[PDB]
Enzyme design. Structure first.
Site, PDB file in Angstrom:
ATOM      1  N   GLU A 177       0.819  -1.204   0.000  1.00 57.99           N
ATOM      2  CA  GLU A 177       0.000   0.000   0.000  1.00 57.99           C
ATOM      3  C   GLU A 177       0.860   1.264   0.000  1.00 57.99           C
ATOM      4  O   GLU A 177       0.511   2.248  -0.650  1.00 57.99           O
ATOM      5  CB  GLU A 177      -0.968  -0.008   1.190  1.00 57.99           C
ATOM      6  CG  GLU A 177      -1.922  -1.221   1.237  1.00 57.99           C
ATOM      7  CD  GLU A 177      -2.789  -1.399  -0.016  1.00 57.99           C
ATOM      8  OE1 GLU A 177      -2.991  -0.427  -0.775  1.00 57.99           O
ATOM      9  OE2 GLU A 177      -3.290  -2.526  -0.233  1.00 57.99           O
ATOM     10  N   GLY A 336      25.079 -28.115   3.082  1.00 57.17           N
ATOM     11  CA  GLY A 336      24.567 -28.997   2.050  1.00 57.17           C
ATOM     12  C   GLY A 336      25.452 -28.923   0.819  1.00 57.17           C
ATOM     13  O   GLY A 336      26.448 -28.200   0.811  1.00 57.17           O
ATOM     14  N   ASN A 347      35.362 -12.834  -7.533  1.00 53.80           N
ATOM     15  CA  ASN A 347      34.500 -13.270  -6.440  1.00 53.80           C
ATOM     16  C   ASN A 347      35.196 -14.229  -5.496  1.00 53.80           C
ATOM     17  O   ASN A 347      36.096 -14.968  -5.889  1.00 53.80           O
ATOM     18  CB  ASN A 347      33.268 -14.032  -6.955  1.00 53.80           C
ATOM     19  CG  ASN A 347      32.592 -13.358  -8.118  1.00 53.80           C
ATOM     20  OD1 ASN A 347      32.598 -13.881  -9.235  1.00 53.80           O
ATOM     21  ND2 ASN A 347      31.989 -12.205  -7.870  1.00 53.80           N
ATOM     22  N   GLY A 360      33.432 -19.699 -10.891  1.00 56.18           N
ATOM     23  CA  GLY A 360      33.856 -18.319 -10.742  1.00 56.18           C
ATOM     24  C   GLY A 360      33.432 -17.362 -11.839  1.00 56.18           C
ATOM     25  O   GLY A 360      33.188 -16.182 -11.570  1.00 56.18           O
ATOM     26  N   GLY A 370      36.004 -25.978   0.671  1.00 56.66           N
ATOM     27  CA  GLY A 370      35.657 -26.322   2.036  1.00 56.66           C
ATOM     28  C   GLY A 370      35.752 -27.830   2.161  1.00 56.66           C
ATOM     29  O   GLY A 370      36.378 -28.476   1.322  1.00 56.66           O
TER      30      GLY A 370
HETATM   31 CA   LIG Z   1      36.697 -29.765  -0.646  1.00 54.33          CA
HETATM   32 CA   LIG Z   2      28.089 -26.530   0.993  1.00 58.63          CA
HETATM   33 CA   LIG Z   3      32.512 -28.357   0.118  1.00 56.42          CA
HETATM   34 CA   LIG Z   4      37.269 -16.703 -12.992  1.00 58.71          CA
HETATM   35 CA   LIG Z   5      33.845 -13.960 -11.185  1.00 58.79          CA
HETATM   36 ZN   LIG Z   6      -2.954  -2.577  -4.261  1.00 59.81          ZN
END
Ligand SMILES: [Ca+2]
Ligand SMILES: [Ca+2]
Ligand SMILES: [Ca+2]
Ligand SMILES: [Ca+2]
Ligand SMILES: [Ca+2]
Ligand SMILES: [Zn+2]
Ligand SMILES: [Ca+2]
Ligand SMILES: [Ca+2]
Ligand SMILES: [Ca+2]
Lengths: 470, 105
Positions: A177, A336, A347, A360, A370
């Site tokens: 709203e 997970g 990154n 990447g 990891g």
């Molecule tokens: Ca690993």
């Molecule tokens: Ca993971």
């Molecule tokens: Ca991993």
């Molecule tokens: Ca890369």
């Molecule tokens: Ca990248």
């Molecule tokens: Zn609305």
């Protein structure tokens, strides 16, 4: 041939596609910009006061009925009575402020607290006699007697507006709203209680609350699923729409911002507090080295750092997105097995526990698998050029894998790698190096065959020929 | 303006889900008792019958602003029935048919 890992990357990069020429769900498919233009079709907006560099709007919470409430029929033909008036409770006022803030965070508007009463440019109040829906508001192109007003239904039969809270319908209703009062329309032509509108009445396919809080339709209509939660803040298309009116707020979160777990945004909707947190948000960030921290979830997740991309986080589908024009640098998976897709800049991607798949993309990326058997995917040699190579920061031979299976050279060119100690002008020659002292290693490949490496990956941990998939 | 989000109690009761005017039908019971894991409410009656149209048997459901969602144990939607009118929810079948949910009797 392309590995399953490569295919997963390719498939998610193309997930939730929009803007194509073909129909989607019997509707034309719109790009973010097209959706924004559509949402602004009525061309209503507030004019910045003379002397103000930024639109400044005050807000107040009615203490009693205003002229409109007392005699609605004099301003709106259909309405004769709104029933019993009631002022916003402390909880309603606190939540309204958070919704107001979520709008001013993304565009250039300064909201000013005008207290209790009817002095605000924007006012809030409750009513008990439904006029067809849960609430209503007026666009800023109406007469002063109605301008800036938003009204919320509360009675013995409907209590959703009584306790607005992060992620629930009451909170989204406030944001929705308020959106109207600022100049946004529903993405399509429909009104609650007026006839029996359905998603089939939408103007474009992406008119769902996976893309706009102004939408009447469920996110499931476009493949997303927030398990009953509702976005408390502006979504992808809302951000694009409102910024077309009052511009992009370039002062917002210019620091190194963390979204999700361990968030420093000080925004409930951008923060996760437990493994059961249902996150629904679209990131607006104007600068800094930012991170999507989803370390606290155990479900397999799919995270995409590209602008306008949607991610499947914490067990939900397409619940996290990044606004157009925003650059998010890093991502941290959970326990997970996750899919982490980077963007064009450098990154930092961390898979966490589980057998993750990291991609990447362009730029020299720092990739951490990891614990678990992780796979680092490459789809184009340009993604890790000899000039700006990625660095695999925790590679474990025999467990992790460097996946080059999707490279054109292999799947289409049939190139075969020849491991050597030095290039000799033969395409496909590769050099695997490792220094036990520094524990540093590298993979260099000369795809062109000019005796010069055109693809390279730095390593912290040794990699052997068996660790490279082609 | 916003749609009224009906409560589980507002929709609770005996409902039937059937293909168009065809004989294919399933009797369902929408309850208003909460089911934490699915972030919804108990779906009783002949839910096993639903496997004729779904990949798994839903045992939970929840109202949505413009419909009703049938859920798997984790809370994800297996089927979303859009509100066509009061007590009339529908979804288009994969082929070309239509499934209609209406109150019993
Ligand atoms: Ca690993
Ligand atoms: Ca993971
Ligand atoms: Ca991993
Ligand atoms: Ca890369
Ligand atoms: Ca990248
Ligand atoms: Zn609305
Ligand atoms: Ca930032
Ligand atoms: Ca950034
Ligand atoms: Ca070369």
């Amino acid at each position: 041939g392309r590995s399953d890992a490569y295919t997963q990357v390719d498939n998610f990069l193309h997930a939730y596609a929009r803007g194509g020429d073909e129909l989607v769900n019997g509707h034309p498919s719109y790009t973010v910009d097209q959706a924004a233009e559509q949402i602004l079709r009525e061309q209503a907006s507030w004019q910045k006061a003379p002397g103000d560099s930024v639109l400044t709007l005050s807000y107040s919470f009615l203490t009693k009925p205003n002229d409109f409430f007392n005699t609605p029929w004099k301003y709106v033909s259909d309405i004769y009575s709104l029933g019993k008036f009631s002022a916003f409770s402390a909880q309603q006022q606190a939540q309204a402020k958070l919704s107001l803030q979520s709008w001013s965070d993304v565009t250039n508007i300064h909201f000013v607290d005008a207290g209790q009463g009817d002095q605000g440019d924007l006012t809030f109040g409750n009513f008990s006699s439904s006029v067809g829906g849960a609430a209503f508001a007026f666009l800023p192109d109406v007469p002063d007697a109605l301008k800036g007003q938003s009204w919320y239904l509360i009675n013995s039969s409907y209590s959703a507006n009584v306790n607005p809270a992060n992620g629930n319908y009451g909170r989204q209703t406030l944001t929705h709203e308020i959106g109207h009062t600022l100049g946004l329309s529903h993405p399509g032509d429909y009104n609650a209680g007026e006839g029996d509108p359905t998603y089939a009445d939408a103007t474009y396919a992406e008119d769902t609350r996976a893309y706009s809080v102004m939408s009447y339709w469920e996110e499931q209509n476009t493949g997303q699923d927030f398990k009953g939660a509702y976005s408390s803040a502006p979504l992808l298309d809302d951000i694009a729409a409102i910024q077309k009116l009052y511009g992009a707020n370039l002062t917002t979160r210019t620091g190194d911002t963390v979204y999700g777990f361990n968030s420093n945004t000080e925004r409930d909707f951008y923060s996760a507090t437990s493994s059961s947190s249902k996150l629904v948000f679209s990131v607006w960030d104007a600068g800094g080295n930012d991170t999507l921290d989803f370390s606290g979830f155990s479900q397999n997740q799919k995270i995409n750092l590209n602008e306008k991309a949607l991610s499947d986080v914490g067990g939900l589908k397409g619940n996290v997105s990044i606004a157009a024009g925003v650059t998010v640098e890093n991502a941290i998976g959970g326990s997970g097995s996750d899919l982490l897709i980077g963007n064009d800049v450098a990154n930092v991607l961390k898979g966490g526990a589980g057998n993750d798949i990291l991609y990447g993309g362009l730029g020299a990326d720092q990739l951490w698998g990891g614990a678990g058997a992780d796979t680092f995917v490459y789809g184009d040699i340009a993604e890790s050029s000899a000039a700006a190579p990625d660095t695999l920061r925790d590679f474990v031979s025999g467990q992790d894998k460097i996946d080059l299976s999707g490279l054109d050279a292999f799947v289409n060119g049939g190139l075969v790698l020849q491991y050597v100690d030095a290039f000799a002008g033969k395409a496909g020659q590769a050099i695997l190096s490792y220094d036990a002292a520094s524990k540093a290693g590298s993979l260099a490949i000369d795809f062109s065959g000019d005796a010069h490496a055109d693809f390279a990956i730095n390593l912290i941990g040794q990699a052997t020929q068996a660790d490279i998939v082609v | 303006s916003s749609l009224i989000l009906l409560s589980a109690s507002d929709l609770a009761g005996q409902w039937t889900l059937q293909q168009d005017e065809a004989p294919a039908i399933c009797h369902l019971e929408l309850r208003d008792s909460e089911v934490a894991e699915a972030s919804g409410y108990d779906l009783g009656g002949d839910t096993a019958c639903l496997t004729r149209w779904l990949p798994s048997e839903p045992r939970a459901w929840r109202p949505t602003p413009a419909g009703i969602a049938l859920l798997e144990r984790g809370g994800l939607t297996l089927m979303l029935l859009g509100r066509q009118g009061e007590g009339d929810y529908r979804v288009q079948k994969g082929d070309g048919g239509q499934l209609v949910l209406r109150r019993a009797t």
